[PDB]
Symmetry: C3
Subunit: 169 residues, 3 copies
């Protein structure tokens, strides 16, 4: 039907140094699957896995999935064998059985929640150091305050802004 998607994929991955399975009809088969999965669930859900029909919960199995590279590295193929390793293509690598590396649902949920908290921390802290203010010190009385710029005049001794200095530490 559409061979268009097969070929544009083959070129997309070859540029980046990955490889599709060299057997053509088995691969185009998987392509049909991916297409159908896109029609049915609205994302490219791994063609050889049960989709949960919820994108958020499947982000790890949208093709290419999070298991592809480790699986290529250990077994010479991704779980469906859509992709095969640079080693298999040539010789060595001996394309072989691939266990399911994806963790079970409960485990995945824990991992996500942990990545959520971790991202929130990093966000909050990055956003933080962005709004922090430098500390200014009056050179007459030593008054300290925290502002982008030193105040017009020291509320203590009245020295002008230009007589403050950035303070450390």
């Amino acid at each position: 039907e559409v061979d268009k998607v097969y070929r544009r994929l083959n070129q997309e991955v070859e540029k980046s140094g990955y490889h599709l399975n060299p057997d053509v009809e088995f691969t185009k088969e998987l392509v049909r699957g991916l297409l159908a999965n896109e029609r049915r669930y609205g994302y490219w859900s791994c063609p050889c896995r049960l989709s949960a029909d919820n994108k958020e919960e499947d982000l790890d199995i949208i093709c290419p999935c999070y298991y592809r590279d480790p699986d290529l590295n250990d077994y010479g193929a991704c779980y469906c064998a859509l992709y095969v390793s640079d080693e298999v293509i040539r010789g060595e690598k001996e394309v072989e059985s691939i266990p399911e590396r994806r963790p079970p649902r409960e485990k995945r949920e824990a991992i996500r929640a942990e990545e959520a908290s971790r991202a929130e921390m990093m966000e909050t802290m990055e956003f933080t150091g962005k709004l922090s203010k430098p500390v200014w010190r009056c050179k007459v009385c030593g008054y300290l305050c925290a502002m982008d710029e030193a105040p017009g005049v020291c509320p203590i001794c009245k020295a002008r802004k230009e007589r403050f200095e950035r303070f450390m530490h």
Copy 2:
């Protein structure tokens, strides 16, 4: 009516080295506004801004607002020009148009939530290092435990409290 509040303000700010607008009637005008805003919303909501009639959401525009000092520094006046800069009062500073520095509602909410998380972290950690316990080491068997004081006797070898030592590291 009440000029009482005008004058007590003028003295309150002059002590700290800020200045009210030298035009008297324009300033007392703003004072009336602030008073009314206090009657209407129960806080001194910036007289030249739309109040949301919720204190929590307006903490940034209670007068004096969070934009006053940066605005004095850049434009020689706060957004309403209740306050004018030390430079304008004398010469230079050329009192000039002030854009609205306050971010729009969505932005403000994000910023607040980020300051909330940041404060929770800092709180939780400060509260944390306060309850942490030192580590005590039996000098006979090396048993380690974490308590304000070493135990009456080592549960391992039975050496008395006075034969423990603070441990590092």
Copy 3:
């Protein structure tokens, strides 16, 4: 009735260098209390304190409680005087009145929530450094990526996996 529990306790604590009150009948009294509290609430709630009949909220007063050791250290006895200090048993230590060290309900709740946040941080961060990936660098073009192992081939220059190196810093 059951003296079984009295004696197994006396041996359990003596091994660890704690001591029960040497008056036998006052102690076995407290034992009966602890038993009853176990029948009534399903945990060994301090026999001389009001139980809230909720384990989660009483974790600090399950016997032995969190106040036992500090109380032994300062007063020579736990709050009920189930336990007496190594000093009292012999001489010195002068067993004496013990105030209630447990903080009031509101305080306890705050402390717990703070320990919760602190534990979540530590968990999230520990779980974090466990999933972080090393950074690999192509030795031909300097391409950087973060994975357990370097890719089959550099998506940039095509150098094979074995021509990458662990990168710092």
